[PDB]
Amino acid sequence: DLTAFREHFAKAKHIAIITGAGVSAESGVPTFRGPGGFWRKWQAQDLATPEAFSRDPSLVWEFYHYRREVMRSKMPNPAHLAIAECEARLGQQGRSVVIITQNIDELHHRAGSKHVYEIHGSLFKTRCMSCGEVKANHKSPICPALDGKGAPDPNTKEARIPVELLPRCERKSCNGLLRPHVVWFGETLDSDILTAVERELEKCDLCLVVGTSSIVYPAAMFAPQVASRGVPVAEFNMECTPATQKYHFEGPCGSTLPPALE
């Protein structure tokens, strides 16, 4: 019941919105997981690990160069926006809206969301292997050596770029090798971030889950902490609810969400 939900919405003073790949998918962004998500011969799980980078940093960067560039043509969809405008509108009323996202495509920012927590990091940040510095970066290409590389055709030739010529740290005294500031498989989340998110979910009086499910990581870490306080939770995804069955609005976020937040 939508009207029931809006009645909550009305009251809410601290709203938290958790977002999964459903929403980045709706903007036409590859997640490279499950059927027909390949990049050349591989899937994410193969390449998004520290072992792969250690072993073959050109190839991993080729992969991430691609993902960086495909973004130039993918725009935020209506869900992205509806949220961003929501935050803005409510901000002005002294209410609060915070986004917690597992996505790394920066689409929330491009839609104009401000209080965003990127818990898997971002494609457009680099961390230095040497000095550990995190710096924004949207350069295209990120470095010359990679220009027009990362083609996804299964029979593409490896670039096999010398590690010295991949993206390096600019502090000169440093010149460390950069990696994407993304959480890979087998890595821990940043605790500073998680402590924040915790604080935010402890304060929230309404929680949305969008393009993923409360039941699965990462929603699962938290929705429990909020639900157990008795706070309403509203899913917006395309997963199915069985006949006999807090709120759940089946359908593409692009469609379901903006009416909800109006």
């Binding site: 898997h120 959480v183 498989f185 087998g186 821990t188 989340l189 605790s191 990581y217």
Partner: peptide, 8 residues
């Protein structure tokens, strides 16, 4: 620290 996707 939390393994991502719970290590799975």
């Amino acid at each position: 620290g939390v393994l991502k996707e719970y290590g799975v």
